[PDB]
From a paper:
H3K4me3 (residues 1–9) and H3K36me3 (residues 31–41) exhibited detectable binding to MRG2 chromodomain (residues 41–123) (Kd values: 0.8 mM for H3K4me3; 0.69 mM for H3K36me3). To obtain the information regarding the specific MRG2 residues that are important for recognition of the histone marks H3K4me3 and H3K36me3, we determined the co-crystal structure of MRG2 and the methylated H3 peptides. The proteolyzed samples were analyzed using mass spectrometry (MS) analysis to determine the protein sequence, resulting in the identification of a region containing the chromodomain with residues 53–123 of MRG2 as suitable for crystallization. MRG2 complexes with the H3K4me3 and H3K36me3 peptides were obtained, but the complexes with the H3K27me3 and H3K9me3 peptides could not form crystals under the same conditions, consistent with the ITC results. The crystals of MRG2 with H3K4me3 or H3K36me3 were diffracted to 1.68 and 1.65 Å, respectively. In both structures, the MRG2 chromodomain contains mainly four beta-strands. However, the predicted alpha-helix located at the C-terminus is missing in the electron density map. For the complexes of the MRG2 chromodomain with the H3K4me3/H3K36me3 peptides, the recognition modes are almost the same; therefore, only the complex of the MRG2 chromodomain with H3K36me3 peptide is shown in Figure 7A. The tri-methylated lysine projects into the aromatic cage formed by the His62, Tyr67, Tyr87, Trp90, and Trp94 residues of the MRG2 chromodomain. The co-crystal structures clearly indicate that the chromodomain of MRG2 can directly bind to tri-methylated H3K4 and H3K36, and provide strong evidence that the aromatic cage of the MRG2 chromodomain and the associated residues are essential for the binding, the same as other chromodomain proteins. Consistent with the structure, the Tyr87Ala (Y87A) mutation in MRG2 disrupted its association with H3K4me3 and H3K36me3 peptides, supporting the idea that the hydrophobic pocket formed by the aromatic residues is essential for the binding, as with other chromodomain proteins.
Numbering used by the authors: 51 to 107
Write the structure that this text describes.
Amino acid sequence: HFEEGERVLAKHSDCFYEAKVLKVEFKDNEWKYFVHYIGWNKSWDEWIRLDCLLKHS
């Protein structure tokens, strides 16, 4: 659904932030995405699930 390198919106807590997908993995019948939040410390990088992601536009 999303690819390595892709600009996306990623939900953290209550709202969506500009982010970039760094890694994609599939395990236990589900996709997960390691995302970086644009402009933010790398310490906030995290694995999130598909329903936490939005394509732009």
